[PDB]
Amino acid sequence: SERIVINVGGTRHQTHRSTLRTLPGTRLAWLAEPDAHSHFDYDPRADEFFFDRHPGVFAHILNYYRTGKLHCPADVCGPLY
Amino acid sequence: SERIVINVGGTRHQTHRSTLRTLPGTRLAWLAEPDAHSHFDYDPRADEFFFDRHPGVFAHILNYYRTGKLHCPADVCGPLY
Ligand SMILES: [Zn+2]
Ligand SMILES: [Zn+2]
């Protein structure tokens, strides 16, 4: 019950709930809480939350959650990120 | 949402909810209702209820639910059935 799988635009991003729980107040912080099945899109057959967003930049967002420093991917426009 | 899978001792018995809903008051009748996830053993990963019983005779119990006539399997003792 420590692992959580985010399905962002069809790409499965997997992480521990502690990682999401680091940065409070943000959307993924609300994901990490146990009252998240009702709040967010979720299918119990695969145990994944689905967000209809660009996955390539969510990699860097989740990297912010993991390491603690926010960086900009040099392969997307400024406004996109 | 019309199909329901019963896992009886490791053998998957599949049926429609109407079939279970035919005979009221019995255990499978309570299974057919929408408030059955909490009442009974159930895992959302496979969407199956698990009962730790002999499956070979549950075949005949479910056949009672389907056809409407209760028969005894001639391959098990009287007290077992
Ligand atoms: Zn641009
Ligand atoms: Zn016997």
XYZ file of N, CA, C and O and ligand atoms in Angstrom:
650
model
N 0.820 -1.206 0.000
C 0.000 0.000 0.000
C 0.856 1.259 0.000
O 0.349 2.362 0.195
N 2.158 1.081 -0.203
C 3.089 2.195 -0.267
C 3.350 2.662 -1.691
O 3.821 3.787 -1.881
N 3.004 1.864 -2.691
C 3.243 2.222 -4.079
C 1.961 2.755 -4.700
O 0.859 2.346 -4.327
N 2.112 3.696 -5.624
C 0.988 4.292 -6.330
C 1.386 4.472 -7.785
O 2.495 4.925 -8.085
N 0.489 4.098 -8.690
C 0.741 4.139 -10.124
C -0.101 5.251 -10.723
O -1.332 5.231 -10.613
N 0.555 6.226 -11.340
C -0.119 7.300 -12.056
C -0.085 6.966 -13.539
O 0.984 6.704 -14.099
N -1.246 6.973 -14.175
C -1.354 6.794 -15.616
C -1.580 8.168 -16.227
O -2.698 8.686 -16.200
N -0.530 8.757 -16.784
C -0.596 10.097 -17.348
C -0.543 9.964 -18.860
O 0.527 9.732 -19.433
N -1.688 10.137 -19.508
C -1.740 10.022 -20.958
C -1.254 8.694 -21.485
O -0.625 8.638 -22.547
N -1.532 7.614 -20.764
C -1.182 6.289 -21.224
C 0.192 5.800 -20.840
O 0.555 4.681 -21.214
N 0.967 6.585 -20.099
C 2.288 6.179 -19.639
C 2.245 6.015 -18.129
O 1.935 6.969 -17.410
N 2.569 4.817 -17.654
C 2.446 4.483 -16.243
C 3.659 5.012 -15.495
O 4.784 4.562 -15.729
N 3.428 5.961 -14.598
C 4.453 6.475 -13.705
C 4.194 5.920 -12.316
O 3.118 6.129 -11.753
N 5.177 5.225 -11.763
C 5.027 4.535 -10.494
C 5.937 5.171 -9.455
O 7.061 5.572 -9.765
N 5.445 5.270 -8.225
C 6.191 5.933 -7.165
C 5.614 5.525 -5.817
O 4.548 4.914 -5.734
N 6.348 5.858 -4.761
C 5.881 5.645 -3.400
C 5.001 6.805 -2.952
O 5.131 7.930 -3.437
N 4.089 6.519 -2.021
C 3.208 7.567 -1.515
C 3.966 8.623 -0.723
O 3.517 9.771 -0.643
N 5.102 8.264 -0.124
C 5.890 9.255 0.603
C 6.401 10.339 -0.334
O 6.384 11.530 0.009
N 6.848 9.939 -1.525
C 7.337 10.899 -2.506
C 6.276 11.936 -2.834
O 6.550 13.140 -2.817
N 5.051 11.490 -3.115
C 3.972 12.432 -3.390
C 3.650 13.263 -2.160
O 3.341 14.454 -2.266
N 3.724 12.654 -0.981
C 3.375 13.340 0.251
C 4.406 14.380 0.670
O 4.130 15.151 1.592
N 5.585 14.410 0.040
C 6.581 15.424 0.388
C 6.024 16.832 0.209
O 5.914 17.593 1.172
N 5.665 17.195 -1.018
C 5.156 18.532 -1.313
C 3.665 18.638 -1.028
O 2.852 18.129 -1.809
N 3.260 19.304 0.048
C 1.841 19.351 0.398
C 1.105 20.445 -0.367
O 1.698 21.367 -0.924
N -0.222 20.326 -0.372
C -1.090 21.286 -1.017
C -1.271 21.111 -2.508
O -2.259 21.608 -3.059
N -0.357 20.426 -3.183
C -0.472 20.236 -4.617
C -1.382 19.051 -4.935
O -1.840 18.330 -4.048
N -1.661 18.876 -6.226
C -2.596 17.842 -6.662
C -2.113 16.445 -6.283
O -2.881 15.629 -5.758
N -0.842 16.143 -6.547
C -0.327 14.815 -6.229
C -0.322 14.567 -4.725
O -0.442 13.420 -4.276
N -0.174 15.626 -3.927
C -0.307 15.478 -2.484
C -1.686 14.945 -2.121
O -1.815 14.032 -1.300
N -2.733 15.513 -2.723
C -4.080 14.989 -2.529
C -4.212 13.573 -3.065
O -5.022 12.791 -2.558
N -3.453 13.230 -4.104
C -3.451 11.851 -4.584
C -2.935 10.894 -3.517
O -3.493 9.811 -3.315
N -1.853 11.273 -2.833
C -1.218 10.379 -1.870
C -2.118 10.029 -0.690
O -1.873 9.020 -0.022
N -3.145 10.828 -0.415
C -3.982 10.591 0.750
C -4.914 9.407 0.499
O -5.187 9.055 -0.649
N -5.411 8.765 1.564
C -6.269 7.586 1.373
C -7.654 7.904 0.836
O -8.314 6.993 0.322
N -8.120 9.149 0.933
C -9.383 9.545 0.313
C -9.112 10.166 -1.055
O -9.304 11.358 -1.287
N -8.666 9.313 -1.974
C -8.355 9.727 -3.330
C -9.117 8.957 -4.395
O -9.173 9.418 -5.540
N -9.690 7.800 -4.062
C -10.446 7.033 -5.044
C -11.648 7.822 -5.545
O -11.924 7.858 -6.749
N -12.379 8.459 -4.628
C -13.568 9.209 -5.015
C -13.208 10.531 -5.682
O -13.850 10.934 -6.659
N -12.189 11.222 -5.170
C -11.874 12.559 -5.664
C -11.404 12.533 -7.113
O -11.765 13.411 -7.904
N -10.610 11.531 -7.485
C -9.922 11.519 -8.767
C -10.393 10.348 -9.617
O -11.059 9.429 -9.138
N -10.034 10.406 -10.896
C -10.301 9.309 -11.815
C -9.452 8.109 -11.423
O -8.247 8.237 -11.197
N -10.081 6.941 -11.349
C -9.413 5.758 -10.833
C -10.195 4.530 -11.261
O -11.422 4.503 -11.146
N -9.485 3.519 -11.750
C -10.111 2.259 -12.093
C -9.524 1.155 -11.227
O -8.297 1.002 -11.167
N -10.356 0.383 -10.525
C -9.821 -0.625 -9.600
C -9.236 -1.840 -10.289
O -8.518 -2.607 -9.637
N -9.506 -2.037 -11.581
C -9.016 -3.228 -12.265
C -7.507 -3.178 -12.453
O -6.836 -4.216 -12.413
N -6.954 -1.986 -12.670
C -5.517 -1.814 -12.821
C -4.897 -0.993 -11.701
O -3.667 -0.881 -11.647
N -5.707 -0.426 -10.805
C -5.218 0.319 -9.645
C -4.360 1.510 -10.070
O -3.303 1.774 -9.498
N -4.819 2.235 -11.088
C -4.109 3.384 -11.629
C -5.032 4.591 -11.670
O -6.199 4.468 -12.046
N -4.509 5.749 -11.285
C -5.190 7.010 -11.536
C -4.847 7.494 -12.935
O -3.704 7.380 -13.378
N -5.835 8.029 -13.638
C -5.645 8.477 -15.011
C -5.748 9.992 -15.084
O -6.760 10.569 -14.675
N -4.702 10.628 -15.607
C -4.707 12.047 -15.922
C -4.430 12.212 -17.404
O -3.513 11.585 -17.939
N -5.222 13.051 -18.064
C -5.147 13.217 -19.516
C -4.225 14.392 -19.846
O -4.643 15.438 -20.343
N -2.941 14.196 -19.554
C -1.936 15.238 -19.699
C -0.715 14.697 -20.431
O -0.577 13.496 -20.660
N 0.166 15.616 -20.805
C 1.432 15.256 -21.427
C 2.292 14.477 -20.436
O 2.547 14.967 -19.328
N 2.744 13.269 -20.780
C 3.539 12.478 -19.828
C 5.004 12.884 -19.755
O 5.639 12.788 -18.695
N 5.547 13.350 -20.882
C 6.953 13.700 -20.950
C 7.371 14.797 -19.997
O 8.541 14.853 -19.610
N 6.445 15.666 -19.600
C 6.762 16.755 -18.685
C 6.362 16.338 -17.278
O 6.914 16.828 -16.283
N 5.394 15.427 -17.178
C 5.089 14.876 -15.869
C 6.267 14.093 -15.320
O 6.416 13.978 -14.102
N 7.103 13.537 -16.195
C 8.354 12.951 -15.725
C 9.142 13.954 -14.889
O 9.622 13.632 -13.798
N 9.251 15.195 -15.369
C 10.033 16.201 -14.655
C 9.300 16.726 -13.426
O 9.931 17.056 -12.414
N 7.972 16.808 -13.485
C 7.206 17.183 -12.293
C 7.427 16.161 -11.178
O 7.721 16.502 -10.020
N 7.287 14.881 -11.512
C 7.520 13.834 -10.533
C 8.970 13.818 -10.076
O 9.254 13.469 -8.927
N 9.903 14.194 -10.951
C 11.293 14.307 -10.530
C 11.469 15.419 -9.505
O 12.298 15.309 -8.598
N 10.717 16.510 -9.652
C 10.676 17.519 -8.596
C 10.223 16.904 -7.285
O 10.831 17.139 -6.238
N 9.148 16.116 -7.323
C 8.677 15.491 -6.084
C 9.739 14.580 -5.480
O 9.896 14.527 -4.256
N 10.477 13.861 -6.324
C 11.443 12.880 -5.838
C 12.685 13.552 -5.267
O 13.040 13.342 -4.104
N 13.368 14.360 -6.078
C 14.655 14.915 -5.673
C 14.489 16.146 -4.792
O 15.170 16.283 -3.772
N 13.607 17.062 -5.176
C 13.362 18.266 -4.404
C 13.700 19.554 -5.119
O 13.510 20.631 -4.539
N 14.185 19.500 -6.355
C 14.568 20.682 -7.111
C 13.827 20.668 -8.436
O 13.811 19.646 -9.127
N 13.216 21.793 -8.787
C 12.419 21.884 -9.998
C 13.286 22.362 -11.154
O 13.927 23.411 -11.064
N 13.308 21.584 -12.230
C 14.050 21.914 -13.433
C 13.099 21.959 -14.620
O 12.005 21.395 -14.585
N 13.526 22.649 -15.673
C 12.733 22.758 -16.890
C 13.306 21.849 -17.966
O 14.511 21.913 -18.234
N 12.500 20.991 -18.589
C 13.004 20.157 -19.689
C 13.320 21.013 -20.905
O 12.471 21.765 -21.386
N 14.546 20.905 -21.392
C 14.995 21.695 -22.530
C 14.414 21.235 -23.849
O 14.831 21.764 -24.884
N 13.482 20.283 -23.880
C 12.925 19.771 -25.124
C 11.469 20.167 -25.331
O 10.810 19.618 -26.219
N 10.944 21.088 -24.526
C 9.594 21.613 -24.689
C 9.644 23.125 -24.545
O 10.525 23.664 -23.865
N 8.711 23.809 -25.199
C 8.634 25.258 -25.103
C 8.408 25.693 -23.661
O 7.907 24.934 -22.830
N 8.813 26.922 -23.364
C 8.557 27.524 -22.078
C 7.090 27.566 -21.696
O 6.712 27.156 -20.596
N 6.233 28.082 -22.586
C 4.798 28.131 -22.259
C 4.166 26.767 -22.044
O 3.265 26.639 -21.207
N 4.609 25.744 -22.771
C 4.064 24.404 -22.574
C 4.322 23.913 -21.158
O 3.398 23.486 -20.454
N 5.576 23.979 -20.719
C 5.913 23.545 -19.371
C 5.237 24.422 -18.328
O 4.806 23.926 -17.279
N -22.156 -4.550 -16.241
C -22.494 -4.636 -14.825
C -23.561 -5.690 -14.566
O -24.111 -5.771 -13.470
N -23.859 -6.483 -15.591
C -24.830 -7.560 -15.478
C -24.187 -8.901 -15.158
O -24.881 -9.809 -14.693
N -22.880 -9.032 -15.334
C -22.192 -10.286 -15.079
C -21.515 -10.233 -13.718
O -21.090 -9.168 -13.263
N -21.449 -11.383 -13.058
C -20.814 -11.507 -11.756
C -20.043 -12.816 -11.728
O -20.546 -13.854 -12.167
N -18.812 -12.763 -11.230
C -17.919 -13.914 -11.198
C -17.767 -14.356 -9.754
O -17.320 -13.577 -8.906
N -18.149 -15.595 -9.470
C -17.963 -16.197 -8.157
C -16.732 -17.086 -8.221
O -16.631 -17.957 -9.091
N -15.797 -16.872 -7.307
C -14.624 -17.723 -7.169
C -14.869 -18.641 -5.980
O -14.714 -18.227 -4.831
N -15.242 -19.885 -6.252
C -15.567 -20.846 -5.206
C -14.437 -21.857 -5.144
O -14.344 -22.751 -5.991
N -13.595 -21.737 -4.125
C -12.474 -22.654 -3.981
C -11.553 -22.689 -5.176
O -11.026 -23.751 -5.526
N -11.342 -21.545 -5.815
C -10.413 -21.456 -6.919
C -10.985 -21.745 -8.286
O -10.239 -21.700 -9.267
N -12.279 -22.028 -8.390
C -12.929 -22.272 -9.671
C -13.896 -21.132 -9.947
O -14.817 -20.895 -9.161
N -13.695 -20.443 -11.066
C -14.461 -19.250 -11.390
C -15.799 -19.658 -11.985
O -15.848 -20.250 -13.066
N -16.876 -19.341 -11.281
C -18.230 -19.537 -11.771
C -18.800 -18.181 -12.148
O -18.870 -17.282 -11.309
N -19.212 -18.039 -13.399
C -19.667 -16.766 -13.930
C -21.145 -16.852 -14.274
O -21.619 -17.883 -14.758
N -21.873 -15.773 -14.013
C -23.313 -15.762 -14.223
C -23.802 -14.323 -14.266
O -23.073 -13.386 -13.939
N -25.049 -14.160 -14.695
C -25.706 -12.862 -14.683
C -26.312 -12.584 -13.315
O -26.654 -13.503 -12.569
N -26.435 -11.298 -12.982
C -27.018 -10.928 -11.696
C -28.494 -11.290 -11.609
O -29.011 -11.501 -10.507
N -29.192 -11.355 -12.743
C -30.597 -11.747 -12.714
C -30.754 -13.175 -12.210
O -31.662 -13.470 -11.420
N -29.865 -14.067 -12.652
C -29.912 -15.454 -12.213
C -29.820 -15.553 -10.699
O -30.624 -16.243 -10.066
N -28.857 -14.854 -10.096
C -28.741 -14.862 -8.643
C -29.952 -14.210 -7.998
O -30.419 -14.651 -6.943
N -30.479 -13.163 -8.623
C -31.599 -12.429 -8.059
C -32.914 -13.193 -8.131
O -33.891 -12.752 -7.519
N -32.974 -14.307 -8.868
C -34.209 -15.089 -8.924
C -34.642 -15.539 -7.532
O -35.712 -15.159 -7.052
N -33.823 -16.347 -6.867
C -34.154 -16.871 -5.545
C -33.795 -15.881 -4.446
O -32.613 -15.730 -4.118
N -34.768 -15.213 -3.836
C -34.451 -14.192 -2.838
C -34.215 -14.801 -1.461
O -34.587 -15.939 -1.176
N -33.590 -14.001 -0.596
C -33.310 -14.393 0.767
C -32.074 -15.239 0.966
O -31.549 -15.287 2.083
N -31.588 -15.909 -0.071
C -30.410 -16.747 0.064
C -29.136 -15.913 -0.065
O -29.171 -14.716 -0.349
N -28.000 -16.566 0.180
C -26.717 -15.871 0.190
C -26.400 -15.246 -1.168
O -25.995 -14.080 -1.251
N -26.572 -16.008 -2.248
C -26.266 -15.475 -3.572
C -27.201 -14.329 -3.940
O -26.825 -13.431 -4.703
N -28.427 -14.345 -3.417
C -29.318 -13.207 -3.609
C -28.702 -11.937 -3.041
O -28.718 -10.884 -3.686
N -28.155 -12.019 -1.826
C -27.435 -10.887 -1.253
C -26.200 -10.538 -2.067
O -25.785 -9.377 -2.095
N -25.583 -11.527 -2.711
C -24.465 -11.232 -3.602
C -24.902 -10.354 -4.768
O -24.203 -9.407 -5.143
N -26.055 -10.666 -5.364
C -26.502 -9.953 -6.557
C -26.771 -8.473 -6.309
O -26.782 -7.692 -7.265
N -26.989 -8.067 -5.062
C -27.336 -6.684 -4.778
C -26.101 -5.793 -4.899
O -24.970 -6.271 -4.800
N -26.292 -4.487 -5.125
C -25.132 -3.599 -5.301
C -24.352 -3.332 -4.025
O -23.196 -2.900 -4.119
N -24.928 -3.569 -2.849
C -24.181 -3.462 -1.596
C -23.670 -4.841 -1.185
O -24.096 -5.434 -0.196
N -22.720 -5.338 -1.973
C -22.116 -6.636 -1.735
C -20.605 -6.591 -1.587
O -20.025 -7.558 -1.081
N -19.952 -5.513 -2.018
C -18.503 -5.413 -1.883
C -18.089 -5.440 -0.419
O -17.136 -6.131 -0.042
N -18.798 -4.685 0.424
C -18.447 -4.621 1.838
C -18.867 -5.885 2.579
O -18.130 -6.378 3.440
N -20.047 -6.421 2.264
C -20.580 -7.547 3.026
C -19.728 -8.800 2.858
O -19.507 -9.539 3.824
N -19.230 -9.048 1.650
C -18.595 -10.314 1.316
C -17.134 -10.103 0.953
O -16.680 -8.979 0.731
N -16.404 -11.214 0.902
C -15.020 -11.198 0.452
C -14.976 -10.861 -1.030
O -15.712 -11.444 -1.830
N -14.109 -9.924 -1.398
C -14.089 -9.408 -2.757
C -12.764 -8.704 -2.991
O -12.319 -7.920 -2.150
N -12.143 -8.983 -4.132
C -10.926 -8.293 -4.510
C -11.168 -7.525 -5.801
O -11.637 -8.108 -6.789
N -10.886 -6.221 -5.831
C -11.199 -5.428 -7.026
C -10.268 -5.682 -8.194
O -10.601 -5.288 -9.317
N -9.123 -6.328 -7.971
C -8.169 -6.535 -9.054
C -8.694 -7.540 -10.071
O -8.416 -7.418 -11.270
N -9.442 -8.543 -9.615
C -10.029 -9.538 -10.500
C -11.549 -9.487 -10.519
O -12.165 -10.194 -11.325
N -12.168 -8.670 -9.666
C -13.620 -8.485 -9.649
C -14.346 -9.803 -9.385
O -15.344 -10.125 -10.029
N -13.838 -10.575 -8.426
C -14.396 -11.871 -8.070
C -14.662 -11.927 -6.575
O -13.838 -11.471 -5.779
N -15.808 -12.483 -6.198
C -16.054 -12.845 -4.812
C -15.473 -14.223 -4.542
O -15.570 -15.122 -5.378
N -14.861 -14.393 -3.378
C -14.214 -15.651 -3.029
C -14.974 -16.330 -1.901
O -15.167 -15.739 -0.833
N -15.394 -17.569 -2.140
C -15.970 -18.429 -1.116
C -15.119 -19.682 -1.010
O -14.767 -20.283 -2.027
N -14.792 -20.072 0.218
C -13.882 -21.190 0.466
C -14.693 -22.471 0.663
O -14.754 -23.054 1.745
N -15.326 -22.906 -0.425
C -16.230 -24.046 -0.405
C -15.912 -24.994 -1.553
O -15.129 -24.684 -2.452
N -16.531 -26.167 -1.499
C -16.413 -27.147 -2.570
C -17.039 -26.594 -3.846
O -18.212 -26.197 -3.832
N -16.302 -26.537 -4.958
C -16.867 -25.971 -6.192
C -17.758 -26.931 -6.965
O -18.725 -26.515 -7.621
N -17.445 -28.225 -6.885
C -18.180 -29.225 -7.638
C -19.652 -29.303 -7.301
O -20.448 -29.721 -8.146
N -20.039 -28.900 -6.093
C -21.436 -28.944 -5.684
C -22.038 -27.559 -5.867
O -23.253 -27.408 -6.051
N -21.192 -26.530 -5.819
C -21.688 -25.205 -6.151
C -22.128 -25.135 -7.600
O -22.994 -24.328 -7.943
N -21.540 -25.958 -8.467
C -22.067 -26.074 -9.823
C -23.557 -26.398 -9.800
O -24.354 -25.770 -10.505
N -23.960 -27.354 -8.961
C -25.363 -27.761 -8.915
C -26.229 -26.737 -8.188
O -27.399 -26.546 -8.540
N -25.678 -26.066 -7.177
C -26.421 -24.982 -6.526
C -26.731 -23.874 -7.532
O -27.872 -23.397 -7.654
N -25.713 -23.445 -8.272
C -25.919 -22.426 -9.287
C -26.841 -22.921 -10.389
O -27.582 -22.130 -10.980
N -26.817 -24.221 -10.682
C -27.761 -24.767 -11.650
C -29.192 -24.664 -11.138
O -30.124 -24.457 -11.922
N -29.389 -24.837 -9.831
C -30.693 -24.545 -9.242
C -31.092 -23.106 -9.511
O -32.225 -22.834 -9.917
N -30.173 -22.168 -9.285
C -30.507 -20.764 -9.539
C -30.868 -20.533 -11.001
O -31.776 -19.753 -11.307
N -30.168 -21.205 -11.914
C -30.366 -20.968 -13.342
C -31.670 -21.581 -13.837
O -32.529 -20.883 -14.384
N -31.831 -22.893 -13.662
C -32.971 -23.592 -14.248
C -34.223 -23.450 -13.393
O -35.310 -23.194 -13.916
N -34.096 -23.633 -12.084
C -35.224 -23.509 -11.178
C -35.580 -24.778 -10.438
O -36.523 -24.761 -9.635
N -34.871 -25.879 -10.663
C -35.158 -27.154 -10.023
C -33.896 -27.642 -9.335
O -32.822 -27.647 -9.941
N -34.026 -28.052 -8.079
C -32.881 -28.479 -7.292
C -32.688 -29.981 -7.431
O -33.610 -30.758 -7.177
N -31.491 -30.382 -7.845
C -31.129 -31.780 -7.993
C -29.912 -32.082 -7.131
O -29.161 -31.185 -6.745
N -29.727 -33.362 -6.824
C -28.591 -33.803 -6.029
C -27.550 -34.455 -6.925
O -27.898 -35.348 -7.705
N -26.286 -34.041 -6.863
C -25.241 -34.703 -7.656
C -24.989 -36.109 -7.134
O -24.717 -36.303 -5.948
N -25.092 -37.087 -8.021
C -24.915 -38.485 -7.648
C -23.472 -38.856 -7.383
O -23.207 -40.045 -7.182
N -22.525 -37.920 -7.371
C -21.117 -38.231 -7.168
C -20.585 -37.732 -5.831
O -19.367 -37.723 -5.627
N -21.458 -37.299 -4.924
C -21.075 -36.888 -3.580
C -22.051 -37.505 -2.592
O -23.207 -37.777 -2.934
N -21.580 -37.739 -1.371
C -22.433 -38.288 -0.328
C -23.612 -37.365 -0.052
O -23.569 -36.165 -0.326
N -24.686 -37.945 0.469
C -25.835 -37.189 0.902
C -25.519 -36.117 1.927
O -25.915 -34.959 1.772
N -24.818 -36.482 3.007
C -24.480 -35.468 4.022
C -23.602 -34.344 3.504
O -23.750 -33.200 3.949
N -22.690 -34.630 2.575
C -21.848 -33.578 2.015
C -22.689 -32.525 1.310
O -22.566 -31.323 1.582
N -23.563 -32.960 0.405
C -24.420 -32.024 -0.307
C -25.375 -31.320 0.645
O -25.664 -30.129 0.475
Zn 5.903 26.763 -27.681
Zn -20.305 -39.208 2.987
